[PDB]
């Protein structure tokens, strides 16, 4: 695996995501930016799509790094079709990957 990001907290319009393990080091530069898009799901069929709002990567001596990502859910994908929704609840924990190109295209397309 290249990225192990995962939802640790759920708010009505806010998502807290922890990157437990980062291997590629290229995903963080482009696909984990300030306004990047994330896919939040436990399966490849139905997912929560969210835009990042904030992040923080803290390192100290003994403990592991704390890569916390702050995102806000914006919609919902069902078998490649995007449904825009302000509030759709994903029960944490949920496995997080960066959104693919066709998923971000689907945000502005299927509406």
């Amino acid at each position: 695996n290249d990225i192990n990001a995962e939802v640790v907290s759920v708010s009505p319009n806010k998502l807290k995501i922890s990157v437990d393990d980062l291997e590629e080091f290229k995903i963080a530069e482009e696909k984990l930016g300030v306004g990047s898009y994330l896919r939040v799901s436990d399966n490849q069929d139905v997912a929560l799509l969210a835009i990042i709002d904030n992040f923080s990567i803290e390192v100290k001596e003994s403990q592991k790094q704390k890569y916390m990502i702050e995102a806000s859910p914006i919609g919902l994908v069902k078998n490649g079709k995007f449904y825009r929704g302000g509030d759709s609840l994903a029960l944490p924990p949920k496995k997080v990957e960066p959104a693919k190109l066709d998923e971000i295209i689907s945000i502005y397309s299927d509406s």
Binding site: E24, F25, K26, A28, E29, V59, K60, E61, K64, Q65
Partner: protein, 244 residues
């Protein structure tokens, strides 16, 4: 024609032929084809040869030195030309197993060799106390006697540049796993591969991404082709410092 009037013509005839990128033709194929054109031209007897086997001679993985592109723009530009061609860097350097094979011969001073080791270890290692994934480069030196090589290793240890070679004691068989731990050890600055027999055994023990950076003057080795290699020929060993 003029010098500039033939630069933008030689590149495209091999650019579409091999279907590669810009650095893989201007810096990798143009440079190698210049000397092999010059080598048959500077020969005393055989001047004209057939170019049937010329296209496969220039496709070797080695980037050859070019003397005519050294006296033209100086050493401050040719090394700067090679530095952004195959020594591409990013803001974040990933924890990869980087191998630096440098050619050491008897005319090369130990102090000149010592200075490039300090340059390679500084750029290509993050031994930070707060890293969860520390990395250190692997160093291989060849073409020199063991007595001259052991003098370099002894001086590096007295200057607090702690390394590992897979030989923690006298009479030890070569253990790959000390070099793998020294990759992940923050207190071990780099790894010293003694020879080729200890080289190829270390490749089999590494599962993470592996990069090989070879810098030589005349003698180059057979790295396995699946690994990403950078083989750069230079005049003196001191030119290696400005590329890495």
């Amino acid at each position: 024609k003029s010098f500039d009037d033939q630069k933008k013509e030689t590149i495209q005839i091999i650019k579409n032929h091999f279907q590669c990128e810009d650095y893989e033709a201007e810096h990798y194929l143009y440079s190698n084809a210049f000397r092999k054109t010059y080598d048959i031209s500077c020969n005393k007897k055989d001047r004209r040869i057939k170019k049937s086997d010329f296209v496969e001679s220039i496709n070797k993985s080695k980037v050859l030195f070019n003397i005519w592109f050294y006296q033209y723009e100086g050493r401050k530009e040719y090394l700067r030309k090679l530095k952004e061609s195959f020594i591409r860097r990013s803001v974040n350097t990933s924890p990869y197993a980087r191998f630096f094979i440098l050619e050491f011969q008897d005319k090369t001073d130990i102090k000149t060799v010592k200075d490039c080791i300090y340059k390679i270890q500084s750029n290509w290692s993050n031994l930070s106390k707060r890293t969860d994934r520390p990395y250190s480069p692997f160093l291989l030196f060849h073409g020199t006697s063991d007595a001259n090589l052991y003098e370099l290793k002894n001086q590096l240890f007295n200057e607090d540049l702690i390394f590992t070679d897979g030989y923690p004691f006298k009479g030890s068989v070569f253990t790959p796993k000390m070099l793998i731990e020294g990759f992940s050890n923050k207190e071990i600055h780099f790894q010293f591969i003694n020879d080729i027999d200890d080289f190829n055994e270390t490749l089999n023990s590494i599962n993470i991404r592996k990069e090989v950076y070879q810098f030589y003057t005349e003698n180059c080795l057979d790295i396995p082709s699946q690994l990403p290699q950078v083989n750069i020929q230079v005049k003196d060993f001191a030119d290696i410092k400005e590329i890495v």
